[PDB]
Structure formats: structure tokens, C-alpha cells
Enzyme design. Sequence first.
Site, PDB file in Angstrom:
ATOM      1  N   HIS A 363      -6.730 -16.866  40.062  1.00 37.12           N
ATOM      2  CA  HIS A 363      -7.646 -17.585  39.152  1.00 37.12           C
ATOM      3  C   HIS A 363      -8.048 -18.970  39.704  1.00 37.12           C
ATOM      4  CE1 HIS A 363      -4.568 -15.557  36.476  1.00 37.12           C
ATOM      5  NE2 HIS A 363      -5.470 -15.355  35.557  1.00 37.12           N
ATOM      6  N   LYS A 554     -13.586 -28.080  26.303  1.00 34.29           N
ATOM      7  CA  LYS A 554     -13.267 -27.722  27.703  1.00 34.29           C
ATOM      8  C   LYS A 554     -12.228 -28.691  28.139  1.00 34.29           C
ATOM      9  CE  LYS A 554     -15.370 -24.298  29.415  1.00 34.29           C
ATOM     10  NZ  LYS A 554     -14.725 -23.367  30.342  1.00 34.29           N
ATOM     11  N   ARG A 555     -11.313 -28.331  29.022  1.00 33.30           N
ATOM     12  CA  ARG A 555     -10.286 -29.235  29.492  1.00 33.30           C
ATOM     13  C   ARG A 555     -10.879 -30.533  29.982  1.00 33.30           C
ATOM     14  NH1 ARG A 555      -7.654 -26.422  34.790  1.00 33.30           N
ATOM     15  NH2 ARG A 555      -9.077 -27.453  36.314  1.00 33.30           N
ATOM     16  N   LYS A 560     -15.314 -30.647  35.011  1.00 36.89           N
ATOM     17  CA  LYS A 560     -15.616 -29.886  33.823  1.00 36.89           C
ATOM     18  C   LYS A 560     -16.850 -30.379  33.048  1.00 36.89           C
ATOM     19  CE  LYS A 560     -13.074 -26.572  33.089  1.00 36.89           C
ATOM     20  NZ  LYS A 560     -12.872 -25.412  33.958  1.00 36.89           N
ATOM     21  N   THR A 662     -13.171 -17.713  29.707  1.00 35.09           N
ATOM     22  CA  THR A 662     -12.970 -16.911  28.521  1.00 35.09           C
ATOM     23  C   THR A 662     -13.536 -17.496  27.231  1.00 35.09           C
ATOM     24  OG1 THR A 662     -11.653 -15.316  28.897  1.00 35.09           O
ATOM     25  CG2 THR A 662     -10.488 -16.747  27.488  1.00 35.09           C
ATOM     26  N   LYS A 666     -16.490 -16.601  23.920  1.00 36.32           N
ATOM     27  CA  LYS A 666     -16.054 -16.690  22.538  1.00 36.32           C
ATOM     28  C   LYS A 666     -17.203 -17.194  21.783  1.00 36.32           C
ATOM     29  CE  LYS A 666     -11.437 -17.704  23.746  1.00 36.32           C
ATOM     30  NZ  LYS A 666     -10.773 -18.981  23.978  1.00 36.32           N
TER      31      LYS A 666
HETATM   32  C1  LIG Z   1     -10.130 -19.398  25.124  1.00 37.65           C
HETATM   33  C2  LIG Z   1      -9.413 -20.712  25.083  1.00 37.65           C
HETATM   34  C3  LIG Z   1      -9.300 -21.436  26.253  1.00 37.65           C
HETATM   35  C4  LIG Z   1      -9.949 -20.990  27.481  1.00 37.65           C
HETATM   36  O1  LIG Z   1     -10.912 -22.044  27.840  1.00 37.65           O
HETATM   37  P1  LIG Z   1     -11.978 -22.212  29.060  1.00 37.65           P
HETATM   38  O2  LIG Z   1     -11.840 -21.104  30.049  1.00 37.65           O
HETATM   39  O3  LIG Z   1     -13.278 -22.206  28.346  1.00 37.65           O
HETATM   40  O4  LIG Z   1     -12.084 -23.644  29.914  1.00 37.65           O
HETATM   41  P2  LIG Z   1     -10.827 -24.361  30.722  1.00 37.65           P
HETATM   42  O5  LIG Z   1     -10.043 -25.058  29.661  1.00 37.65           O
HETATM   43  O6  LIG Z   1     -11.523 -25.346  31.585  1.00 37.65           O
HETATM   44  O7  LIG Z   1     -10.072 -23.305  31.499  1.00 37.65           O
HETATM   45  C5  LIG Z   1      -8.737 -22.728  26.182  1.00 37.65           C
HETATM   46  N1  LIG Z   1      -8.266 -23.209  24.993  1.00 37.65           N
HETATM   47  C6  LIG Z   1      -8.352 -22.479  23.865  1.00 37.65           C
HETATM   48  C7  LIG Z   1      -7.888 -23.046  22.568  1.00 37.65           C
HETATM   49  C8  LIG Z   1      -8.932 -21.223  23.906  1.00 37.65           C
HETATM   50  O8  LIG Z   1      -8.951 -20.435  22.752  1.00 37.65           O
END
Ligand SMILES: *Cc1c(COP(=O)(O)OP(=O)(O)O)cnc(C)c1O
Lengths: 823, 823
Positions: A363, A554-555, A560, A662, A666
Site C-alpha cells: 500500500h 483526510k490525514r 494530502k 477507500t 464512501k
Molecule cells: C475510510 C476511512 C479512512 C480511510 O481514509 P483515506 O484513504 O480517504 O485517506 P488517508 O487517511 O490519507 O489514508 C480513514 N479514516 C476513517 C474514519 C475512515 O472511515
Amino acid sequence: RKQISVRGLAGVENVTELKKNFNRHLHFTLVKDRNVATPRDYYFALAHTVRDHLVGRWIRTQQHYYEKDPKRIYYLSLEFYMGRTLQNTMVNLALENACDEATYQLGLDMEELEEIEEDAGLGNGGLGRLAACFLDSMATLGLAAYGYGIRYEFGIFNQKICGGWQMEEADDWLRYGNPWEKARPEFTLPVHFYGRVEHTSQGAKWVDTQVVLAMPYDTPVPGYRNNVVNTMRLWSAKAPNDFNLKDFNVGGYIQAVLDRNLAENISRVLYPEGKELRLKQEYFVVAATLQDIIRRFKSSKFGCRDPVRTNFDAFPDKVAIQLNDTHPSLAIPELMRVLVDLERLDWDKAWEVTVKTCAYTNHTVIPEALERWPVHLLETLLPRHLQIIYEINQRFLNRVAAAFPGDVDRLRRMSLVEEGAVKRINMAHLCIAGSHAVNGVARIHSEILKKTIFKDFYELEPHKFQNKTNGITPRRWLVLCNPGLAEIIAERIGEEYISDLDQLRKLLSYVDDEAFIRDVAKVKQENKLKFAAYLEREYKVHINPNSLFDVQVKRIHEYKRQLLNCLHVITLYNRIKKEPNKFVVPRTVMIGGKAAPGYHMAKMIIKLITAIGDVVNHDPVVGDRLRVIFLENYRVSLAEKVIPAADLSEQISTAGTEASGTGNMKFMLNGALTIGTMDGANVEMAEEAGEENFFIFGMRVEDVDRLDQRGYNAQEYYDRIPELRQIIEQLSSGFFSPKQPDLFKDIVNMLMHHDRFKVFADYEEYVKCQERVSALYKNPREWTRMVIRNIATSGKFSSDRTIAQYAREIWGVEPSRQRLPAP
Amino acid sequence: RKQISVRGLAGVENVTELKKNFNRHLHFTLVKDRNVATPRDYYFALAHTVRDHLVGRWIRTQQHYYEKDPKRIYYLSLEFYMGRTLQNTMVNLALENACDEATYQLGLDMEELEEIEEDAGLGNGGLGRLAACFLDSMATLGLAAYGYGIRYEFGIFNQKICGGWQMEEADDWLRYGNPWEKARPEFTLPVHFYGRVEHTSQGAKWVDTQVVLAMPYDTPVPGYRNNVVNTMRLWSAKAPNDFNLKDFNVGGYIQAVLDRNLAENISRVLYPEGKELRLKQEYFVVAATLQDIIRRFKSSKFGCRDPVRTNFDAFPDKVAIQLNDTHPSLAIPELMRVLVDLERLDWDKAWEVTVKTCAYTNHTVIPEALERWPVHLLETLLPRHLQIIYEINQRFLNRVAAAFPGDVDRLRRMSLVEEGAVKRINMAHLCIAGSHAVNGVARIHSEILKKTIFKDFYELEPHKFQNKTNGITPRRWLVLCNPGLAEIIAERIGEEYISDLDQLRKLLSYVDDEAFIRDVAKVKQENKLKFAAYLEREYKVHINPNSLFDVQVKRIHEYKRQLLNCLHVITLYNRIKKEPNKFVVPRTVMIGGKAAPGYHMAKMIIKLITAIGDVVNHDPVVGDRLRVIFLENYRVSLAEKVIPAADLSEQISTAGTEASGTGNMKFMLNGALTIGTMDGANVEMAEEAGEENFFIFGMRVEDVDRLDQRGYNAQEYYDRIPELRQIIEQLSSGFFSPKQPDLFKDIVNMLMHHDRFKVFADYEEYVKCQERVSALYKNPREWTRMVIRNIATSGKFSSDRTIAQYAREIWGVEPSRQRLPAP
Ligand SMILES: *Cc1c(COP(=O)(O)OP(=O)(O)O)cnc(C)c1O
Ligand SMILES: O=c1[nH]cnc2c1ncn2[C@@H]1O[C@H](COP(=O)(O)O)[C@@H](O)[C@H]1O
Ligand SMILES: O=c1[nH]cnc2c1ncn2[C@@H]1O[C@H](COP(=O)(O)O)[C@@H](O)[C@H]1O
Ligand SMILES: *Cc1c(COP(=O)(O)OP(=O)(O)O)cnc(C)c1O
């Protein structure tokens, strides 16, 4: 004995039997009463009343896999972002409507109680949300799977914003019990650290080890109304507690109170460099799992199915082990040392097994982020495993010589042992070499793997590099959080979609059907109102229900990009104020995610988003035309509140950075429009939806590369664009921070002089794609129909599909959405 | 809400329902099925199936005390010697019949199951057993009583005999948990250590304190068929767990790893001098406890019943605190502190309430045992309570100045501070000064506290000094351990005796009835048969079930004189070898006790006791006429087994040494005749049974003081008695010790040169007594009728009387054997 059976202990969808068990558990399980109970107390009565039903089907499922002895599949993740289990188990078990009726007649409110659950603090992001998606697909697709991880007592921090600065509180979710788990002290197992290896006669022996204990915990995963329930087994580390008089290390000096606390905090926190503790965690979760595995291989009817050594010849036949990113890589040498050394298979019969049992999901894209332990570190706490990684390695480099003779420089690149100042072991290369199937998680990622990151491995073993595109489960993420949109989807095309998401393309038939188009619209107007309500009632603001809910969850990292989104916000703010009477489609800009302790850029970005928030939200000209909210402490149960609510989903990473995404999916399945650069999972989403349904903008990867090639000079953009110019000088004179002018200095110079990620370059084009978002929202019929098109196309992204693609091309097993009889 | 109720939750003595709940708990609570359930697993489901009936009337009892609002009395003790709860909860709840039949049908043996239970390691000795009989009696006579105290993870040691030397193993009884307790993480309370006293304005402010959280566990204790169930609340320590980054003590240094373990083993270990951990454990329990007490005072419908301050004016009308021994004593300086610093009452009102609230039970005779803490320890960790304790002392010494003016030497004898090298605070004087009733534990023991040890306090407040002679409870120590005697006593006089024991006097009419005589000797023959069997089956020996069963089960101290008894056994030995063919009453001498790790005589004694027996039980001429067995790891489950079997009760402490003796009373109740000095509990049981029916012997207490007066010169005895002179030379030459002659060298010298308890003095007459014993034995009908007079006179020794007297005479509440309606 046969009279002691799972059998007369329920009537399920029955309000009067769920009311009588709700009363047995408050009283007898919780030993409380209605005179003395709380909402926390009534949630564990109900949490326990739904739990009885869930373990009945847990029992019958596991008996039924011992008696049918199928291939067993072990998802091995160091993170399981479950989050909240009550409504999900009631929706996967068919009991939501009877729980609600019974609690309602017991004069209480399930929605209240649902909201007392603490999110299972076992994950921190993507990597872990995904495993928890895949467990729901895995249980639904009848598979015989297991999730295995460390159980973290303090999650990973809770976020609190104080003075618009992020503070990290600690998450002790475990604080009043977790009604969904069962502690098994009876299956505690040694995990062995340090030592020295003594080569005695027929083998080596790894002697003089410190021992930590690994205690397992069972939490059951149900499947969508298919009556199976599988297992999540997480391991707590615990000190031997002899440290008193017993051992005669003690008595004299109890400074071995440090073994004790450095044992116990392998299980104590998520992370969050080359730390002894990280590798103690990876070894620990890997070691205690491998025994529990080999145990069921010998025990699960296969004791009597020995025919040779309880042969490890039929070990890959009945087992798979998935190593989700390099975090369980030591399960390859740990499997080899159990087989070689403890059992006695020769090196090649055991290798045969290892590479036919392990498969590894990747990943990461940038090589700067693939796993890598120093060898002295490995010498010191795992001697024999550095021995094995060296022999696995010598063989592998000779295999490569049987293949590209004369190439030296390939040998010095495909080695598991990296040279420099500080020789390391490269866990990536281990994982490839010790397995039979490598798969990235988006097609452009899997292919850039083959093409650049694992290329030489691709040439020597091209057959290995698969791919399996990431996915979301239709249950948590559409039935459970958006029951309203699910309702109307069932009204037109029925349920099967819940358990089969490509069936949602039938929705294009209704694209122009005015009923559907008012109904999809209404459901989002429901979902926004409810989130606008929570936005006062837990945290505070005056949201407009009619604005465009723009959300970026997003993190909070520099690549990002929320700094792009801030400059587009201070572009709107500035505009609304330069001409206070132009019609500008109003927007609610909401950003959320967690910085990461000590990343100070990430921390100045949380402080910008809030100070912008304090100016635009409190200036009177702007009226209700624009507001900037920082959603605090973003986490899985917030994600299912806000994703139903959003109309624009800011996917904006510099292209080439993201691997997949992911939560992108959503937002799509949940009727939002994505604005996004072309990368990660935007690509196969845009591709399914048809590009014109999508707000793609910005440089593409090739354009990034050219800019790098002639070198990005951020002042030229700063010098063309007169808005950008202005907002930069506003940050700088402290328009946004009057008390401390100089406060965003470092964010100015980051931008102005060392943007690794080209914010200013994707500026001009970013706002113009936003103008195209505003402009469409001001014509509700067509925006609602683009939304119908993104939603009928979801299908490519259900994790029931991504899993089948694991089942068939990798674990080599058949899914089956067959109901297992039960209860 | 009102429909959430206990009402429809149990069809009790019904075998078909108990089978149902069995199967609920095995599966749903344990998440186990018969394919994988162990006897522990089935032990726990039964535990819980019986528990549901328990918590249901815990319920009802505790609802009833809140509605009724009675004087509820808090029994504080740092050791609760409980031992196995199942059979005791069934018999008390009347479920024993339906559960046995039920498990019989399920095809489980309940007796195999009842022996899985671990002996509740909260206790150690008398002080602790006494707390468990008193809690049973307080339920049965429906008092609103609470037992409070710490939860010890590690019990105390579980002994093993390896090679005739004692080994302490640890009791990790909480290993697979405890089905009878409910954790209440909800009610976790802070307890502060160290600190600094900031004398600010209206008071003193204890600042800068370290915190240790006390988290409580609740356990139910059932009455004798009256449906009141009371609570046993045991506290566990938990350090605050911010210790990672939160506090900024840390990051830089986590060497406050130590805080969290020095906190944790407050609860870990029982004890087992002036060690800060004992003082932190005692203050730990007091502080937590009293916050619960005042929490319940202001809550228990008195938050409504305030009239003034929610006044503490009526606190002694709703609270009774019993300081069992000096371990709870900071209850007196802590209740003032709360009252005076935290609420705000002034010192004379607050003191009024403390003394009327607090009452104190003493269990020691020798001034050398009473507890005493250095003022430098108390200043360091409880600097605020050192203040209060000095002001308590000052004002008490002016009271004594009121009363005996002119006196200089009483001020200094009576004072709480003690002078010397190491200025101490005398905890026994704290208790007397702030308690309203001081009591002893047998008549003589309370008189010598009034006459010698506390007399200058007896003069200032002669009203204070009571006595409440101990007791044993008839449920666990007659009904439960001995069904066979229970039953035949019930044919004759009915069941009320079990909840009314003095009416065992009714038995005295059946003295000469041969049906009773016979039956009474049949049950012992039963009991001895079965104990003889346990001595082969679990441990091993070839007991002769017809022999006189001579057992001494007491704490292996010099003063407990097992050595005496050893001189006598060696005497019997020597006679059977000298005169091979004289008829001797066959005996089986059984001794048992836990040494006390660190006490070297006691370790040397168990060694004697094993090797005497290695000699005689193997030697061919003694045949089966004599055997000596050591009863390993004596604990409550062994007491309920060997006390039913015993024919002769070996109660020999030098006189003047015991304060009482509860195994004494247990033995009487089961028809075992007493050989014993005129000491401790022996006195009033001689007085009940009649001295003709007691084997009293040896130097009365008068004669002790005489011998001290002129000087005990042990050699004179050596030199008169030829058996004594001989057995000393046998020990010394190595007759018992042939591979290390010189082994009992330090036992031989002790006895010979510096016996502080005079074994040799009572030797001659002891064995003359013993001869009486064996004679009567060789005369069944008259042996078996002495027993009947003894049993029939047991009434004064049921703990129901001791509490009834505590109730009326010190706490101020009425007993009642009334059956709460319930279930
Ligand atoms: C689905 C999910 C995630 C996954 O998030 P992302 O892949 O969109 O972005 P990164 O955070 O940059 O990997 C993260 N947090 C929650 C709460 C969630 O349901
Ligand atoms: O061989 C078996 N026969 C029947 N039931 C079994 C057998 N082995 C395990 N079980 C069930 O399998 C469950 C899970 O066991 P695990 O896979 O060994 O961790 C247990 O709770 C039992 O209900
Ligand atoms: O005000 C009350 N009314 C009735 N029952 C109560 C009340 N408060 C407590 N209880 C009962 O008291 C038990 C113990 O509470 P505690 O004594 O406050 O620790 C609860 O389990 C209830 O059965
Ligand atoms: C009753 C009892 C006791 C009490 O022992 P004693 O009071 O007879 O005298 P010491 O042995 O000197 O304390 C201790 N242990 C158990 C198991 C028990 O039943």
C-alpha cells in the site's frame, strides 16, 4: 453431555424475548438496577442482549468449520479500525427492528444508547479501516477467516482543539469494559524475545530468551444475514508475575520492574522510526498467531488427517496468511523457524510451504516508505530470525544468478540486505521473496509496482505481481449510515444490492424519473439537516442547511493538501468581501483529520484552518454565505455521520502520491460529487462513472514529472496570479492572526520556497473547477442526476468483490453467499 | 422504565430451569460449548447459574435496606478469609438439591466441580476467618452490613512440602478470574499519598499529592434462608495511566514506571515490621472506604434528609464503623480530615461524630504486638494526618489532665506519641481515644486488656471496655462440612438450631439414648472413613480409619507448642518399641500449619514433624498403632474436611498466650473432645461443657508467672524425667536425622536453654492427660457420650450470638431472623 447444547436458548425477532433478555442482563450481568442505572449501563444491558444472538451463531459457525474442515484464512493486520459495533450487529443479524420496538416499550431510546459506544480504538486510518471492511465481506462470502492483531488499550490519541491547536488526549476506550469481547486467559502463549542461538547437533536452539506473554481476546464478526459469524482474535502482552521472590533475579533487585512495564506496553499503544518497540510489536503479533494457526492445523480434524508429519504438505492446502503491508513480514522467517527448527522439515520442504502459504498486500508507492530494520537491532532481539533472513537471502541471490547470470548489479539490488552506514534488512524484499502472490491496491499502483518499485522482482517472478483494487462494504457504509438512501434504492430495485453492489447500475434507468430525482434529493436534504443539527448540539456553529457541504476528511499531511483548500477558501472569503452583493452559491467548508504528534507542519495547518474559521465565520458581510469548520476528532463514527451529509468530497492530493482511497468511495456511494486530481482511486472511480460525471482537475502525474524535470519555481505562479499574491500577504501580515503576525511564517516560506507538493501550481486550475462545482449546484435537477450516475456505478468498489478477487486469484478459495442454517 | 424489573427472572428449585441457565452460561457467558468445555468451564457455568439467584435477592435485600433506611454498619478488615463459595451459596440459598439433580441429569458430577474452586486468597488466619463468619451472621440476622478491604491478587502463599522442608508457591487464584465478583470501574476513587500542608485561611489544604485510584469489586454474601444478601466490597489499586507523555513528568523520563508498580502492589500482596507498603495499604483501604460511606450517607435518601450540612449530626445514627484491629486505624484521623478540611465542620463537632461513629476490636495480649509507626514515615506520606493525630493527642492529654491532675507519668504513659530512639505513634492508643467501645474477644482476654495492657485508659473511660466473645457460624462449620451430624441433630430437635444454635442444649436429653449414641458414632466413622480416603487419594499414607484422630491445626509458632505434642508422639513411639506387646490405643497424629516465611524455628519444626513420621510410620514393630501425618497447605477447604473427622482437638498453647481460638469452637461442634490448657477460648467452652467433659492440663496462668518469678530452669525437668531425657538425646544424636545428625541442634538447644514458652514444664502432666484420653477412647459408649455433652453445649459459640451482642451492645441496632419476601 449431548444434553448440554446451544439449542433452546432464543426465539430471536421477538420483542418480548429481547425485552426479557434485556432485563436479565442489566440485573444479572451488570448487577445494577433501574434505580441506579445510567445510559452507559443500559447500553451494556442491550449490548449484551444482542451479544447472546451473535455468539449462538458464532458457536454453530465454528463447529461447522471444524466438521467441514475448509481451507482457513488468516488476515494479519497490525490495525483493525472496527469502530462501533451495536447497530451493525443488529443490521447484519436482522434484529434492528425488534431491538428498537422492545427498548422503545421499555421506555428508552436506542439512538441515545447507540451513541454511548466508544469506537473500538484499534486503528488509526486506512490500512486498518480496510481490514475491517474485508472482515465483513469475508464473513458474508461464507469464508473461514480470522482477523489477528495486537489489542491496544489506549487506541491512538483522541483529538481535542484548544486555541485552534491540536492537543492529543488518550483514548481509553477500554474504560468500562467492551461488551463485545471475551478474554481467554486459558489460551495465553509465550512469545520469546532476545536469547542466543546454540547450534546443537541436529539443529540450532534459540536459548536464553526473555519471554513476554501473549493473551488472546475473541470478538465475533457477523456476516450480512448469512448466519455465519467469524473471529477477530487480538493479543494483549502480559508480564510473567513471578517478579517478586520467584526467580532469584528478584528479592535483591526489583529493577526487573522494567521487564514488567516494557512487556506490558507492546499492547499499550498504537504507533502513532527504527524503534525497538515497533519491531517488538510486529514480532509479538506474528509469533502468537503462528502457533494458534499451526494448532488448528494439527487439531482441526487434521490430527487424525496426519498421513505424514501431520503434513505440512497439506499445510498450504488448508491455510492462507495475508500480510497486510510489511508489518507482519517476520511471519515468513517465524514460520520457517517453527518448521525447520521446532518440527524438523528440511529447509526446502519448509520453504515450499512458506512461499505457498504467504501472500502480501502492498500500500506504499514512494520507496522512502518501505519497511527496514537495522541488523544489529535484529541481532539483539531476534538472533535466529536474522540467521534465517540471511539464508533465505543467500539462496534468493543465487536463484537470481540462475536467472540473470553476469548481473552483479542486480544482486546488489535484489538482496534482502541493504548496505550503507547502517546495514539494514529490507522487509519489502523479504515479503516478496517469501511469498506466492504480491498485490498492490489500485491498478496504477500495482502497475507502477511492477514497473518501478518491484521491477527486478517482476522480471525474475512476473507471475506474482497481482492487484486487487480497494473496496468499502455496502453494509456499514450505505445500509447502516445512510438508511434513507438505501430505502429508496430498495424501493426501485430490491435488496440484492446489499450483498451484491454491481446491481446498483440498474439505477441509471431512473436517471430521468422525477420521483427518483426528488427522492435522492430529499434524502440528502434529510442527512444535511441532521448533521447541521449535530453541528450545534455536540461541538457548535450556525450551519446553513442549504449550502454546499464541501468536506475534506483526510490525514492532515502536507501531500494530502488542505493548504490548497485553504487558499481556495480565502479566495472565496476575499471575493464575497470585494463585491458583497454578488450571488455566490453558499458553502459550508468542513475539514477534518489528525495531524500526527510532532509533525509541526501538520500542526500549523490545523491552526490555519481554525483561524480562517474565526475570521470568515465571525465577519458580518459574509452573512451565512461561507463558514469554515474543523470537524474535531475525526474517527469511524464521525465518518458515518458526515459522509451521508456531504455534497462535494475534496479528494485533492498532488497527482502520483495516493495509492488508492477507500473513503473516496464512501462519498461516491453516498451521493456526493468528488472534485479530485487524477490519482489513486479517483482514476477507476472516474473511469466507472464516466469522466464527465467527475470534477477532475490539476496536473496529472506526467505533468508533475516535467515540472520536476525543469524544476518548480513557486514565485512565478506567485507572480502571475493576483489573488494568490494577496492571500499570501494576508497570512504574512497576520490578517488571520492579529495577536501574532508572524504566526504563519513557516507556512508562508514552506509555500514560497520549498513546496515538495505544488500547491501554487494546482491553484489557478483548482478554483476554476470549483467555479464549475458552484455553478452546477445552482441547478438542483442536473446536480441530483450527476449524483445518480455516480451512485449507480459504485459497484466496482464493494469489498465483497475485492475479496472474491482475493478468494479466487490468491487464497484459492470459493466465496458463497449461502445462508448457513443456524441460529 | 418501571417495566425494567427483577420480577420475571427465576423459577428456582426446578431442575429443568437450572439445566436451562446452565446451558446459557456455558455458551453465552463463557462462549464455549461441550465440545471444548473443561471442568473449570463447567465449574464457572454452574457458579454463574447459582449466582443469578444470588444477585436477584441482592437486589431485593439492598432495595429493602434503602427503602427501610436502617443503621448500616461497615466492617473494616484488611483480610477476609472466605474459601469457596459455591456450596455455601447453594445451601444458604436452598438451591443445593435442585442444582445437584440438575447437574446429575446434565451428567456432570457436582462434587468433582465443587473442588475446582480456588480458595479465596484474601485472608491468612484467624482475623480473616472471623471476618467471614461475622459476615454470614450479619446476613442471617438481616443487618445492613458491609464488609470492606483490599483485593489481593496473589492471596498469600500456597505451601508445598519438598523433602520435608516448606516451600511457599504463590496463590494466583484470580488467574481464570472469579465468577462471584462484579467489577465497578464506574466507582473508581482517588487516594492521595505524600503531599504538603498549605495552611490556607479557613483551614489546611493538603496539596501536591500523588494519586493511586481505588477501583472496587462487589461480592454478594447470602443469609441462612432469609433472602437477604449483603455486600463485600473489596478494593483493587490502579495507577493513573497518563504515564507515557501526559503530565510532562514524562517523555523525558518515564522512571515514574516505578509510581505505577508501587501503586499496583498495594493490591497485590498480603502481608504475610515498619514497611511503608503496609502503611500505604492500610491507608489505601480506609480512604476509599470512607468516601463510599459518606457517599452513601449523603445519597441514601438522606440527600433528601439533609436538615443541616446533610448533617453529620445524624451520621452516627446511620453509620457504625468497626475497626477490626489496628490495621484500619487511620479511619479515625481520615474521617476527621474529611469532616474538618473537606466539608467544614469544626473540630469539636467533627470529633463528636468520629468517636460516636468508630468502635475498636483488639485481638492481641502481649504489648509487644500492638502496632506502631515511626513519626518520620507518617510525616513523609501522610503529613496531614500526622497533624490531626498530634492535635487528637494534645486534646486527649488535656482530658487526662482534667481527670488525674498533678499526674506527670500518666500523660506520658497514655499518650499517642511514644519516646525513645525512634519517636513512634501508637496506633492502639489512637483507636481507644477516637472510639466509643473497645472490645476483646474472650472474657479473660478483655479483662487483661482492662487490667494490664490498656488500664490507664480503662480508668479514664471504664465505660468503653466491652467484651464480645468470638464465634464460628453453624452454616459453613456444621451444616456444610458435616451433613451427617447436621441431619441426625435435626431428626431429634428440628431445623431452627441452624439459625438458633443454643437449643443444641436439647440434645442433652438424648445423652443415654442409644439410638442417638450409635448414630452420633456412625457419622464420625463416616467422616473418618472419607477423610482417610482423602489422605490417599489427594496426598497419600495408609491411615487406620479406626484410630483416635488427633489433629493440631494451628499457626506453627513456638508458643503454639506443636513441639510439645512432638515430645509426646516420640514418647508413644518409644513405649511401643520398649514393650512391643502392651495394648496401646492406636492414634494418628495429624499436624498442620503454614510456617511464616522467614521464621526459622517454624521451618525447623515442620522438618521435625516430617522425619519423626519418616521414622515411626515405616518402622515394622509400631505396625499401624502409630502414624504421624503433616496436613499440607492448611486452608479453609481442608478445615471443613479434617475438623469433621477429628476425635481429639490439640489446643495446647502455653497459658496466658491465647486471646481466644476459633478452630477450638469448630472442633467442639463436630464432636471432638478437647485436650487443652486453661487458656483462651478453652476457658468458656470448659465452662459450657463442664470441666468433667474437657481434657484441661498443664500450668494454669498463675503458675506461669510463678515460674517466671523464680526462673524457669529447664534442666531440672530434663534431669527428673527419664523419657524427656531420652527423647532429647534421640533428637541430638541424629536418631531422627541420620544424614545430618547435627540438624535439630538448634531445636534441642532452644528447648534446653531458652524455651520462652516452657514446653518441658507441661511435659509430664501433658502425657498423663494423654493417657486419660486413650483410656476413655477404649470405651466407645462413654467416649461417644462425652462428645454429646460437648456438641449439646455449643450454643455460646455460634457467631450469630457474637454479632447479636455487637448489634445490641455496641452498634445500636436490633437483630432479626425475618425472611425478606423476595426472591
Ligand atoms: C475510510 C476511512 C479512512 C480511510 O481514509 P483515506 O484513504 O480517504 O485517506 P488517508 O487517511 O490519507 O489514508 C480513514 N479514516 C476513517 C474514519 C475512515 O472511515
Ligand atoms: O473439533 C471440534 N468439534 C466441535 N466444536 C469444536 C471443535 N473444535 C473447536 N470447536 C468450536 O470452535 C470454537 C473455536 O475454536 P478455535 O478455532 O480453536 O479458536 C470453539 O468455541 C468451539 O465452539
Ligand atoms: O435510591 C435507591 N432506591 C432504591 N434502590 C437503590 C437506591 N440506591 C441504590 N439502590 C440499590 O442499592 C444498590 C447499591 O448501591 P450503593 O449502595 O449506592 O453502592 C443498587 O444496586 C440498587 O439495588
Ligand atoms: C478456624 C480457622 C483458623 C483459625 O485458627 P485458630 O484460631 O484456631 O488458631 P491459630 O491457628 O493460632 O490462628 C485458621 N485457618 C482456618 C482454615 C480455619 O478454618
